[PDB]
Amino acid sequence: MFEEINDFETAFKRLLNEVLEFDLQNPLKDVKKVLCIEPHPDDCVIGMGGTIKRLTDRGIEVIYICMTDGYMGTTDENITGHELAQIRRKEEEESAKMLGVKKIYWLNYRDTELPYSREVRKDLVKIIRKEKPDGVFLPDPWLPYEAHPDHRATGFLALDAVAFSPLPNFSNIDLDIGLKPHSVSFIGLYYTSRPNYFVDITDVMDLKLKAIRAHKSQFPDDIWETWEPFLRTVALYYGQKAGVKYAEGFRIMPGLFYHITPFAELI
Amino acid sequence: FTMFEEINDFETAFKRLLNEVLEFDLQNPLKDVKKVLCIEPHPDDCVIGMGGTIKRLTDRGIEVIYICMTDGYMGTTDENITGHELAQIRRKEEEESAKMLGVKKIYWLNYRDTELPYSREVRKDLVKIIRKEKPDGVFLPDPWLPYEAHPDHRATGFLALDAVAFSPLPNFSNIDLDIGLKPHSVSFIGLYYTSRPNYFVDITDVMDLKLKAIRAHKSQFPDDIWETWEPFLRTVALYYGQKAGVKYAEGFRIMPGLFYHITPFAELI
Amino acid sequence: DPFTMFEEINDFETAFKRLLNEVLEFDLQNPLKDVKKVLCIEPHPDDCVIGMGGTIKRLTDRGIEVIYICMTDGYMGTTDENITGHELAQIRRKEEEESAKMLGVKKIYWLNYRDTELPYSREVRKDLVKIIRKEKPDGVFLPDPWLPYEAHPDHRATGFLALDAVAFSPLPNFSNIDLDIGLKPHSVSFIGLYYTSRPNYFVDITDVMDLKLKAIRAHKSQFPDDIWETWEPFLRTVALYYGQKAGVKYAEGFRIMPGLFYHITPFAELI
Amino acid sequence: FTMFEEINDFETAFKRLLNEVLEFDLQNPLKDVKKVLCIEPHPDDCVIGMGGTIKRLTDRGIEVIYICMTDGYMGTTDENITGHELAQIRRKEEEESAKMLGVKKIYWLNYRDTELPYSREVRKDLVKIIRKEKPDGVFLPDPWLPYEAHPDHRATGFLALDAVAFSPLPNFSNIDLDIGLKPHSVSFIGLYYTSRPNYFVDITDVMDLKLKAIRAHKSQFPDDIWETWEPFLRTVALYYGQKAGVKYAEGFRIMPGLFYHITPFAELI
Amino acid sequence: FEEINDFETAFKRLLNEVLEFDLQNPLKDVKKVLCIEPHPDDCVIGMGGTIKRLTDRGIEVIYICMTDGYMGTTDENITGHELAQIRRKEEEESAKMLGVKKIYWLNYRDTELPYSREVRKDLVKIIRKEKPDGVFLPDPWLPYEAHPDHRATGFLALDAVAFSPLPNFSNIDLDIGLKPHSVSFIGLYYTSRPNYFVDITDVMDLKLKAIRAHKSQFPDDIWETWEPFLRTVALYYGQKAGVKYAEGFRIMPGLFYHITPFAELI
Amino acid sequence: FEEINDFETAFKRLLNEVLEFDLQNPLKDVKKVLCIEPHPDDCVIGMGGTIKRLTDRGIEVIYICMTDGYMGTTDENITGHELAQIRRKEEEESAKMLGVKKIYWLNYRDTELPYSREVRKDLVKIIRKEKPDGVFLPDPWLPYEAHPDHRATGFLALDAVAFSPLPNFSNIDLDIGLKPHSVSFIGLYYTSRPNYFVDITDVMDLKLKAIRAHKSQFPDDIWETWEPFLRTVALYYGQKAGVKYAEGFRIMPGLFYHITPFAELI
Ligand SMILES: CC(=O)N[C@@H]1[C@@H](O)[C@H](O[C@@H]2O[C@H](CO)[C@@H](O)[C@H](O)[C@H]2NC(C)=O)[C@@H](CO)O[C@H]1O
Ligand SMILES: CC(=O)N[C@@H]1[C@@H](O)[C@H](O[C@@H]2O[C@H](CO)[C@@H](O)[C@H](O)[C@H]2NC(C)=O)[C@@H](CO)O[C@H]1O
Ligand SMILES: CC(=O)N[C@@H]1[C@@H](O)[C@H](O[C@@H]2O[C@H](CO)[C@@H](O)[C@H](O)[C@H]2NC(C)=O)[C@@H](CO)O[C@H]1O
Ligand SMILES: CC(=O)N[C@@H]1[C@@H](O)[C@H](O[C@@H]2O[C@H](CO)[C@@H](O)[C@H](O)[C@H]2NC(C)=O)[C@@H](CO)O[C@H]1O
Ligand SMILES: CC(=O)N[C@@H]1[C@@H](O)[C@H](O[C@@H]2O[C@H](CO)[C@@H](O)[C@H](O)[C@H]2NC(C)=O)[C@@H](CO)O[C@H]1O
Ligand SMILES: CC(=O)N[C@@H]1[C@@H](O)[C@H](O[C@@H]2O[C@H](CO)[C@@H](O)[C@H](O)[C@H]2NC(C)=O)[C@@H](CO)O[C@H]1O
Ligand SMILES: [Zn+2]
Ligand SMILES: [Zn+2]
Ligand SMILES: [Zn+2]
Ligand SMILES: [Zn+2]
Ligand SMILES: [Zn+2]
Ligand SMILES: [Zn+2]
Description:
With 267 residues, chain A is α/β, with parallel strands linked by helices. Chain A has one domain (1-267). Helix content of chain A is 42%, strand content 15%. In chain A, strands 3-2-1-4-5-7-6 form a seven-stranded mixed β-sheet, sandwiched between helices. In chain A, α2 runs parallel beside α3 (81-99), α2 packs across α7 and α4 packs across α5 (149-164). Chain A is globular and about 70 Å long. The C-D interface holds C 73, 84-87, 89-90, 93, 112, 114 and D 71, 82-85, 87-88, 91, 110, 112. Bound molecules: a molecule of 2 linked components (NAG-NAG) (6 copies) and zinc ion (ZN) (6 copies). The site of one zinc ion has 4 residues of chain B, from loops. Chains E, F: This is Diacetylchitobiose deacetylase. Chains E, F: InterPro entries: GlcNAc_PI_deacetylase-related (IPR003737), LmbE-like_dom_sf (IPR024078). Chains E, F: Keywords: Metal-binding, Zinc. Chains E, F: Zn(2+) 3 binds at residue 220.
């Protein structure tokens, strides 16, 4: 019912606490397996590398999905995109090990050329339906001034895949060959400007930064002079709001708030 | 009139632009509207979004036509219902919901749920209807609604605005003209499902009919589901209500046509 | 980048100020310092003059080369049932050539994608990069694709495509045939967003306003007297909005940020 | 109509299928046709392809409507003519060519020369017209013409056949119905520009008018060009002529609608 | 590695010795086949007789239906959504009459079947799961075939067969269990250039009854024209096979579907 | 001279006098040609012999490779990214053996070559720069060609040739220096309807060695079947040219690629 209620603030608090059982305090309660979905090789480590270490240690299985092949990411006129792909595959495998990640799916869409297509949704759902994960981390597609199409696409496609994985009529051949529908229990947005849940990474920062530099191709010493200070400044932004030094921010909301929720911004 | 060049305050020029130049009436914005389109992504989006307001407009004697972008093919967790069945069902569910609110005509584009293109082709389909029904008003979902993760919603919002904007251009889908349909300018644009509403409608009296017209969509709202949705729908009506100083309201964003293009102060309404 | 350790910082506000001033050398005060050549990228014929026509005059006068890229052909922009889109294109080409001269713009590239039908495709990125790589410009102006309530697809597309083209122009693996036929990669030094609701850098145009408005009306097809009764007051009201924030009468606003902030920068909004 | 199962020769069943079951009339195939569409990829394709036949049909009192798929934007080597100019020009050139042959109405889709999609959207546009003009006949270029390297031609051929086939299905572009246009079945399909024609038309009397109506397209045929095209166009008319036992003829391939689907003996006509 | 100097010699040696191409008994070691149909009814109309004979000889036959049949009615009262639901049941009944147990439905909309990468990926996924020995698909080179769903299905089928064995193609299929697969046999049905026939004179009455199972597609109005047609087709194929009623197929070695200028000579 | 009443007369006069079509020595004034190949190896397999002979007679030959060869291995250990890198080196070595110095790589992915406007624009850009006299491309009408990248390359090549001289097509090409260009000669390789041949009996062993340069595509397993095939192809072409081993091409006037119902008669 809820007919008896006359205040919005009352109905809001009752909707989150009683109806949805939304737990912002310990939101990872029953999570044994998560997917981290990264646009490019290095996006998971840069975005939430610290948190992935902490989850790996607490004994939680972490699987990467890498949307693109990193083909474009060099100014060096001597490295063909084909070489760079081969390289950045090895660089992610090394970064992965340092953080405790064992499995990585490679979609192999070309860097800069990631469709916001039905086909890519179907690919992501196939994996979600197989690995039956409890949680999914994906980049916030509403991050202001994000000018990289592969990031915007990955964010939207991830949410669509999460939302449609439980619908048996969606990519129905997945069912006809064994894969049953699946509902993810937890959705975390990384790389967000409106985080509502933080993770202290002050202890783990040095490992995070070493696991980033594992991506040698992306971070020679030239480049690293600018990126190290940046990455620290990011951790401090998140830290300020979490009252620690170095933190990683995430936006966590109930699945319901990703649809026709005009008060979604109030968490 | 007197010279606009003479103005030195923005606040002055702004108030003069809205009141004198545009004649923008936030007070009674539906003044001369005899016919409106409500554009819904899925079967149930009109009734959930602005079902109350549709009843009130139907009663005040205003013709209300639905355009449904998709067929609802995907919207069941029941492994026994093919998308083809569910479409057939949700067509009947919208026809029943429609009658309860006083809506007589519904156009079905029949784009598949989850597979609504943001294509030129879909704009052409919407314009064709607008040009035929010559409506005074169009309601459509705010495509800028924060955290809206459903592509069919984002698409419908953008496509609707594009269709409104391009319906009056004779060079757009010119075959429409060559077969009878003359260009048309809509007089009124309302965004429903918005987090930035500037105009409200008391629905406290009509809430029980609205909720009954939602449950008409049996396939979407068994009792399991309805335990969570009823409280939600009420919480939404209260959010809108708070800002309108009533209990249960429906919010809309209404702006002048001009503000949907290169208007850096559009947010200030 | 002096004596001090970046690890030793415990305040965000400190690290932020040090990132912008020392690491990035971000100059919001005089951001155009060493710019001899800019591209202005416009969705339709008239978008450059309406958006930043004043600023283009001032840059032309200070001796800076300004090149237009026009994404579309303006084919759709008339209610007159007698003008075919093919006529209107031909017309608006001449109207932009006249507007261009009044502002000191000599070169204009026409992509000739049809008005209302501008793809957000790879192909269009390749076209923009080709030009950037040829003209090796120091600066690019493009419309803010995050402008609230912008309902025109050609505007949203142009904004995104422009940023992508800027970002990918320096990657030799992107449209590699461009290289194989002479065009070397290029890094733009400056990015300005026009038509933005979050400007951080202004330009007094109070002196230039009357020329700007005359250069807009050069687009006769788009601004008969009927229409102009509503647009003149609007355009002035816009200049005042920007003016208020710049403490002058009539200004043009731009959003200028470091290249890095267009990617995974959660504090990008704080500028 | 008497006892099909007891046939044991193919040749018998074939002759009975064409004569009795389909009533296929290769002799006088235009019997009851009062209105036809000629579908041309570019401005000039109808006059070059079947200009003579169009004159003869116009004279015998039959209404002939052009559909032009593209705008001709690309068709000049002159570095001074923008595609926008050339479109405007070739529109006037087709209007003058049209009058010389007795054609009053022309639909312009305005897809750009070289950029004609083989999309669903273009089928929907063609069906809209077919459903309005309710024509008895449609002429379109044979998409199986060997070594045809122009995509706009291949596309137009396929799209035309699809539009003919789908015009009578009420579930196809259903909004067409919801706004007045009822389904329509075309009675006659003619392929022009074909290497396997089965029906000819003497144009020996009309040739000089045809050639004058081609040159109406000044932009496409200066004197330089015309030195090579006039002899070509005559050589084509002779190829068709040889098979029709006249001097100058126009060839068409006419088959029953059914043979455009899963007909392994389609080639035997 | 012979320096042979006649083409006719090298040709006969290529087919018989190098490729072991058996036009005589080409189904030798086939325990499982896919029949790929554009629309519900295309398998039964095309090769319904042959499917019965393969079912009886104990061979597993699986249907893949590309489209939903949404468009296939002139009746202004039947929504495409109804017609889909109906034609699903009609194919299930037709299927049983011929001994077909499993049917995959891609549910691409009738008239709207993309020739996209995405559709290739869908077909490969199935091929890689069912590991079939054989695939039947409609000849995309059939002259005057004006139905896009048919042309598309033909091309997509061949592409799927060709790419199913490449581990780099739709690599996620592998990462979740499905290993690459090489089909051993490719049959084109609905072809004007058949090189292998099947007597269906005994089975014809069942075939025709299994077609009429598709009530929506064949009321009595329509059936007056289709029955004679379907018989005339069987006779065309029959004439070349020296029986009354036959079904024709084009069977070639995998290799001949690529850069083979003498492919036509079989 | 309108007053002709035989077709055969007008036809012979059209080819000889009006068009000056020279099937006898069609390469007369050609100093530079493009060979357009779908995959790395398609030029050497298709017309490798002819490329050697043109290189020797002092004619510049440039390759355009549409795809990256990413898919072309059954080996589950080679990522497509590795295979691309490899086949680049394999084509560079094959190229040198035949006298080819320059190669353009479009880097569209194997199996994923769009028949898009964008790809036409890419090909025209090159044609307009290199101003070649001749272009060789695979016959898109080759019967039973089931590889989409081949069909696409054929069509795209013809479109690029046809549109390179139109200043309104990809107009930015002009605005940055590249003037329009008309190719003088079009040769279709990999065709079943050739009208012009080239003896390669002398060059065969080099051709075959230049093919095997593509190690990734031709281990010894594979080569057992391909060597006999490649010889059988050369013999097919040879038979019609009255030599042992030949390469066939279809050469027609530019005009015959449009609305020419007698195009087949050459
Ligand atoms: C798009 C833009 O202007 N921002 C730049 C980023 O694109 C860029 O990120 C890197 O871009 C490459 C090009 O596509 C990618 O291959 C690479 O994966 C990606 N790296 C990350 C961090 O995801 C960064 C750093 O090069 O600079 C921005 O300015
Ligand atoms: C996108 C997301 O994660 N949010 C969920 C919504 O997608 C979902 O909305 C319903 O989605 C179906 C799938 O396409 C539609 O058929 C149906 O019309 C739609 N309902 C509405 C209100 O339009 C809702 C309901 O399950 O839950 C969200 O969390
Ligand atoms: C309502 C909406 O979505 N936007 C309208 C605009 O379309 C329109 O702007 C003009 O649109 C034409 C059609 O695409 C363009 O050709 C024309 O250049 C464009 N003008 C500018 C400034 O770029 C305006 C003006 O009528 O109204 C908007 O509301
Ligand atoms: C495909 C090819 O290379 N053949 C040429 C034709 O494509 C070409 O056709 C002409 O193409 C122009 C640009 O697409 C069109 O504007 C023009 O209408 C069209 N001609 C006709 C009569 O349809 C012809 C003519 O230049 O030459 C062929 O060689
Ligand atoms: C293009 C044309 O004129 N040929 C017609 C066929 O397209 C048509 O095929 C039928 O099309 C329906 C709509 O796409 C399908 O639902 C239906 O399954 C299909 N029939 C078969 C046997 O597959 C046929 C039959 O109406 O008539 C041709 O003339
Ligand atoms: C389509 C089909 O069934 N025929 C096969 C050909 O497709 C195949 O060609 C090869 O395909 C690979 C995958 O795309 C390519 O990487 C490779 O370049 C290509 N070979 C050539 C000659 O270019 C051939 C050989 O693998 O076998 C046919 O059976
Ligand atoms: Zn990234
Ligand atoms: Zn919805
Ligand atoms: Zn504009
Ligand atoms: Zn043409
Ligand atoms: Zn069919
Ligand atoms: Zn190849």
